[PDB]
Each structure stands twice: as structure tokens, then as C-alpha cells.
């Protein structure tokens, strides 16, 4: 009953959501930064659908990456997407912050349903030595 296992693209994905193949569902990039949150729904062919960031909401400070503001931004992005035809999306989370689950909840409220919780966060295997330590 719905195998969460990696759905390989081999013959053949026999699961459609209102006429949509898993190998063609529009992508939804949600950068969950520490003190910021952005909603950039990039289509498969790199097209726009809902680039509604917290900067356009009104505030340009730490108020970006929060809960209620992030959910409102996600709802606005979901409305903008539904105005163009999207509904189903493959969330691509980036970074760890308040804009991780609140954005998904706002998108669900708007109307967009999530089918996969993908996360391509930056995992440097001892590569880029991060910023030095800091004190309080």
C-alpha cells in the first residue's frame, strides 16, 4: 500500500494524481533558511509558478523566517500557483529553519498537495570548512 521506497523511473509508474506522472510533477523549492524563508516553485522546464518570498510580504528583517508569516507566504504562493495550474508538487526543502513545515502547511491550506518530501540540503563531506566559531 503505497511504497515509500525510492520510486525508480523503471517501467512503470502506475500511480497518477489527476493525470500526472511522478517523473513530470512540478518541483517546489522551499529554502528554509535560519532567519529567512523563500517559496520559489520552479517548474520542470525552469518556469515560474509562485516566487513569493518574505521580502514582498512587507518586512525585510528577521520577521522573514518565522511561523505565521511563513505560512501566509506559502498560502499566497499556493494561490498564485493554483491561478496557473499546479496542485500537486514535489517539495524540495533546502536548509533547516522555521520555513520547513510551516511553508508546507501553508501550501496545503492554499490547495497544493505534497507528494514527496525531498531535501537537497548542503552536506559538505568535510569540504568547505564552515565559518569560524562565535561567542554570545
Amino acid at each position: 500500500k503505497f511504497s515509500i521506497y525510492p520510486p525508480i523511473p523503471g517501467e512503470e509508474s502506475s500511480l497518477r494524481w489527476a493525470g500526472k506522472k511522478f517523473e513530470e510533477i512540478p518541483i517546489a523549492h522551499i529554502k528554509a533558511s535560519h532567519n529567512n524563508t523563500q517559496i520559489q516553485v520552479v517548474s520542470a522546464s525552469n518556469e515560474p509558478l509562485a516566487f513569493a518570498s518574505c521580502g514582498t510580504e512587507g518586512f525585510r528583517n528577521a520577521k522573514k523566517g518565522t511561523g505565521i508569516a511563513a505560512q501566509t507566504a506559502g498560502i499566497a504562493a499556493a494561490a498564485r500557483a493554483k491561478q496557473k495550474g499546479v496542485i500537486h508538487i514535489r517539495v524540495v526543502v533546502k536548509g533547516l529553519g522555521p520555513g520547513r513545515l510551516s511553508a508546507m502547511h501553508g501550501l496545503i491550506m492554499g490547495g497544493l498537495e505534497v507528494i514527496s518530501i525531498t531535501d537537497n540540503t548542503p552536506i559538505p563531506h568535510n569540504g568547505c570548512r564552515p565559518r569560524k566559531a562565535r561567542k554570545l
Binding site: 533547516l96 505534497v114 507528494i115 514527496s116 525531498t118 548542503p122 569560524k132 566559531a133 562565535r134
Partner: protein, 86 residues
Amino acid sequence: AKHLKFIARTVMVQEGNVESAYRTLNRILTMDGLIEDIKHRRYYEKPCCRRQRESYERCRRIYNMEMARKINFLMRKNRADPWQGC
């Protein structure tokens, strides 16, 4: 980059219950061993501080395993007054 794009870390969702898939992805990431890695990569961990962190983690893990074993062994005694003699 040179790896296949959408195959791994693809926790599917259904029934409109993203909380279940969210918790599943969280459990997967915790069992894999990368959430703490990224949290510590948020800044530069000094080699001294890194070794201290690893030592403290190993010590706490050994202590937790010992405590869990002791609990699983001694959870039998949980009645009340079986003898009532005193």
C-alpha cells in the same frame, strides 16, 4: 551533481497527512546520521572541541545503553505489596 537527481531522500506522501511523511523523513535522517553533522557544520568545529564532542557523545551513548539494559532487566519489580510482612 554527478549523481542521479530524484531517487534518494524521496519520502513519498499520501492521504494528505504530510506530518506522517515528515516524521518518517526525520526518523530516516536521524538513523542515517546527518542532522547533527549539518548542525555542527553550521559553524567550524575546532579539532580540540571536535574531539571533546566525540568523546562526550561516546560516553553519553555508553551510559544510555547501560541504563537501558538495566531498565530492561529490572522492570520486572513493579508490583506493590506482595509479601505485606515487613
